[model samples]
Target: LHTQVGRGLLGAVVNPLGEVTDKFAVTDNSEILYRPVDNAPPLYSERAAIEKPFLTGIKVIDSLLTCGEGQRMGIFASAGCGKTFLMNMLIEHSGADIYVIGLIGEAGREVTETVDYLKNSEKKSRCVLVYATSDYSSVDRCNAAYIATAIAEFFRTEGHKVALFIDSLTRYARALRDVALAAGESPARRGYPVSVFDSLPRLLERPGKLKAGGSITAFYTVLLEPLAEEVRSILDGHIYLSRNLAQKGQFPAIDSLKSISRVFTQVVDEKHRIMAAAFRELLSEIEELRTIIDFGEYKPGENASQDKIYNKISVVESFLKQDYRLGFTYEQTMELIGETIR
Candidate 1:
């Protein structure tokens, strides 16, 4: 079933089995069957450096956690920390040639919301949403990830740069757990079978630049703290979302201090790198001062240095608040970050 999708694959709402979930009829374009799982990644000799920045419009992302083509990134956050909301921002604003989103084991309500949301997006026709929500069987949800990766690989082979978004790895792992437990396997930490460890890397290895020409910039959301470290070890980098900032009404409350992009130094320019590093250092200082303020016994201006520190930190904090409506370019974000730091 994974091979049947043809021209209608784009803008088509599909299940993991490649069945149409949309209203319109779609004809199969390709005759060859593609394996949805265990597709080998590009060879070391064929792999190329990710030079082009995958510009995510959010200020914090573009400036602090800059992503690039052929990179695999994790979005680490706890539940209710607004991970999906940030993913929507990426879907709306990133400059990828195409988008393939997998919503494995998500709630029914959010699934529809994403379908409708992508349908109305700028590059709607270039988007493919593969999902098996909570109501589906564990196997169905587990299959969704592979099909989504398979779809992205299809576009990549066609020389189209694709962005694949997986909502949360935690749910998919649980699906695997259910399947493993049913098979009478020994459950490991968090009730996951030992096979879960081996299976995840196979899933992650699929996204990257093909030696021929195309690329897949994959972003997988991670809800489990323990699992993110495992995911991060294999990926390029991760953007850590902050619940503390979320509670303060900071949309896309990403923790730049915690986030690191392996390709950041390679993709970003020299001046931009210097500024970003400095900004990050200042942010670290702000975190230290914030701790003192939270102590309650500390008085503002009780130390003259503390007064100036708050003055600058306030401006820096406000700069993180982005106007998500605007689709910003990498250069534009860089300039803003440079000026804001001054």
Candidate 2:
């Protein structure tokens, strides 16, 4: 049920078996920990309440779609909508002692580029990648995420704040579907076998804050919205990205109104909670007027209050648009929200 890989794994890429080409030797006198990659999550009572925010250094996320340490979140996005881009950004900026990136069913080229990116990062010594690219079979792809989470859990059990990122659970589910059908399992809801639904929760609930020590904050991406729906209620919140917004060239392209954090109120103090809530309220009000915006021939000054709100919305949107070249810590993110959303 276990193995000893040693600290030699840092700043490297490991496969499902913890042996990638970049792996180094374990010359230690058995000082390295031998931990299993698959273990039951800590009991719900044994897990501490999520008290701290997991910063992504992305404005929209920090201010609007705040995520928490030990929280399970679904990052939902369509094709070409910057989900990978956001994952990379979080790797660079999230406050975690160890980072594990799982490239389940990703393109070969994308996996290569991601490996290079992580290796070159300043925190590469704390980064690890467990990947099964498109070249792999469906069974292997389905198992890749477990290995990656197991790696993170190894560090989490060592009292390290571990952040695990799985690129797309939908792809993982599709991989499961392929394997199940091959095994002659009957199809169930959404053409997926019974085990597909059974498997997703097992993977999703693997990471959490241990009352003993340390935490594993899991960010799982979902390529299919339908799959997100099946598991949506289980997550702390789901960050939904919009293809339409990206088409309009919104940098982050996150659907602010749709992406919400259920535990955000408890993650921050009263002022922060109210500030973020009010800002979100403003955005929702404006969302209701999208029809007017689409119809065109609209001008500000219909009413002083609405016009003023419109002015503030423009400022917030401009501030929310982020670039690959820049990142804002939580302090900066909150300050800017205060500065823009008046």
Candidate 3:
């Protein structure tokens, strides 16, 4: 294979060090290999502002937890909370020019499922996967995310809105911890490196609008609660999935009250903003009402009112309910909200 820069690598499996193994394309070819190292100097030039929203075709996400074209958002929860399923839905519906998936220190089964879904789906042409599972060394797993980030930058520089999806940064951090322990590095909080907070931001910062014109939108999955909170601080927004909701058979299981989008005003439409606010308020009131009912202290007259409130809340829940295989557009979401409120 010729070593040419800026060429697309099609149908090749690469190692963490950028080496192509037995994987090769029958028709297309792999792009030129670049060393898996992050040593590029920073540009001091001003970049274009992120003004447009990246619509993922998810009703709740686009309306309530709005995401911009060049912003980073996190999807966080415990295992079995359907984060991976939702992430796959995003890859299918986001309409991004490029998709970079980093499977770092996770189960190989997840990688196989993800790859199979993309292969069968129509979005395979726009997607790329970088993987290092628990079967690999800790150092290799730790480098997988960085390698994926580098690949994303290659496309972002070429003027594409790339979506980077990391399966779970918690595993990545654990890999880092393992590497640090092997290197005899002193540990910080939770046996992680002293530079854990500082190092994590560097990768997150890579997914913004480049000075040249292209942008990268990132969604990192955090498997642990504490790490999820830490990641939330660095990201533009976060969707917190809940075990309680999942146990109740909620598909997305996103905890509305726990999630927040800092760039909601910048990326969401005015109509959506109003509707989302109303919905959130109603949900809060419903939760309070449910608590009162659970306490069994409601007056005889209030019992009927509570029943009505619960019915209304159930209607709202039905509006939020969506099949994971199918996604709702921005207009469809607004229409549902309008009908429910009416």
Using lDDT as the measure, name the better of candidate 2 and candidate 3. 2
TM-score of each: 0.90, 0.90, 0.88
Q: How does model 3 score by TM-score? A: 0.88
Report lDDT per candidate: 0.80, 0.78, 0.74
lDDT winner between candidates 1 and 3: 1
Name model 2 segments beyond 4 Å from true.
1-6, 23-33, 189-197, 300-302
Please write out the lDDT profile of model 2 over residues 1-342, one tens digit for every residue. 454344556766776555655622222333355677557868888899998888888888888778888988888888779988888888787778888888889887887788778756767777777888787898788778877887788787778889988987877888878887775664553434345547778888888888887899988998844677777977888888898889888978788888888888878888787788778877877765666677883577766766676667578778769987577888888888887666
Q: What's the candidate order when arranged by decreasing lDDT?
A: 1, 2, 3
Model 3 error, position 266 (Å):
0.9
**lDDT tens digits, residue span 1-342, model 3:** 112123354434445555544222222544675534573523546445667888887767776787888888888888878888888889877788878788887778867777677667667666667788788998788777887788777777778888988877888878877776765664554334445435677877777877776888899998854666678788888898899888887777888899887878877767777888888887888889878878976565667867766779778788766687787777887888877766
TM-score preference between candidates 1 and 3, better one: 1
Each candidate's number of clashing pairs is 1, 0, 1
RMSD for each of the candidates? 3.1, 3.1, 3.4
